[PDB]
From a paper:
Multiple strategies have been developed to modify monoclonal antibodies, including chemical conjugation and protein engineering. Recently, we identified a cyclic, 12-amino-acid peptide that binds in a cavity formed by all four IgG domains of the cetuximab Fab. Owing to the location of the binding site within the Fab, we have termed the peptide a meditope (medi-, middle, + -tope, place). Based on our observations, the peptide–Fab interaction does not affect antigen binding. Herein, multiple crystal structures of meditope peptide derivatives incorporating natural and unnatural amino acids bound to the cetuximab Fab domain are presented.
Author numbering:
A (entry chain B): 1 to 220
B (entry chain E): 1 to 12
C (entry chain A): 1 to 213
The structure:
Amino acid sequence: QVQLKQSGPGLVQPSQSLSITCTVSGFSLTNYGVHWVRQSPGKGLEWLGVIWSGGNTDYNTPFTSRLSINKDNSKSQVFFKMNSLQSNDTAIYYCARALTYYDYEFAYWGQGTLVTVSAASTKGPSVFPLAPSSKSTSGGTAALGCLVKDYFPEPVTVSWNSGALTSGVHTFPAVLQSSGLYSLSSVVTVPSSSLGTQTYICNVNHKPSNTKVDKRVEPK
Amino acid sequence: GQADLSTRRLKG
Amino acid sequence: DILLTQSPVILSVSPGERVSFSCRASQSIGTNIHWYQQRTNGSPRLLIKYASESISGIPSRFSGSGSGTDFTLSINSVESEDIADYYCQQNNNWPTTFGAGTKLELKRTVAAPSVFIFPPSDEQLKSGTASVVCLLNNFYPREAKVQWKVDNALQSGNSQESVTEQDSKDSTYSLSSTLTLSKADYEKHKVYACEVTHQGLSSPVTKSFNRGA
Ligand SMILES: *[C@@H]1O[C@H](CO)[C@@H](O)[C@H](O)[C@H]1NC(C)=O
């Protein structure tokens, strides 16, 4: 029942600042320090700093002047704030808790927060069906999918039939198009005979633009 | 060798 | 800061085999090293703390050793679900630092891709763009060629590929090739074909459709 949940992924403009909330449960901020760790293309896993039980903070050397960590013990919330972001601050940001109150053995992690630094605007995606067909069958097995196109920034979550359908699902890594917008597909293979009985819906969520689309996918 | 954004995994 | 070097960057083993991850430190760090597993879309998962100590919920097949500068993360009998990245962390010296990681991939028998092609939806054609998608599903090894042809014209530069990480259950990959066209170009031609080449196919497989049917 120990958990850390972070605020949603988002875009930040160059030189602007980054704010993330880590809400914890199954323990008390008065008893444990919360650490912040990011993971970037440039530097991999990188420890950023910590807020201790009693409110003291330590910040990693290159972040002394642009990092502030605060908390609200009663609300079980820890607040991370970093100023003056540049492109190479694009990274997944994590809060984490150690096993023991004073240590650095990170046993519990938040789900991460993908932060993109860019001057671009947020754009929600269009969802298009990848319809099952004769040219999409294979010995009693049909492939079908969703094309999630022209969004920014990453990430987008896709699930099938509201979480209920997982077997045979592949959600591909997003590719960056020349437009500078991203695109990905998510596919699933199902029995051909279930195409008449079962409904198939990809649930698309692009949190940075708050775009939620449920796309029904049918034989054409 | 490096962390990939689209993958959340190492890629080359 | 203490530099941690993980070698090699990539490990490829068959299931049931033993596998060692190496992590070397730029000066002695005693036994103050922790190891993590990171799966696709996952947060780091703590496997071993202080070089050799167990963690609740981590399978017994994971263990670690070493002291000073040379450490090993061991999986004695590797399973398909161990497909992940593995990191080491030192905390003998402030600030705690992480190695760059080692990728663990599994070997398995050759598996030919199942190939499926999808015309652009009429929905998308309204927007003025056409995407043609070719899916290569559940194959091994990763290397594959997708060739696009429109009315026998070779397509080049106007497609993009994405490949899933290795599946944790069956150790296969899947690949999508998206050919992108203007609607105008799309409505100007009839035959859309993707030809797939792979080690598991005795000859290339072509999936095609005619715009319309
Ligand atoms: C980003 O750029 C700065 C220089 O402006 C550099 O010191 C830093 O190491 C770079 N990489 C990351 C991941 O911040």
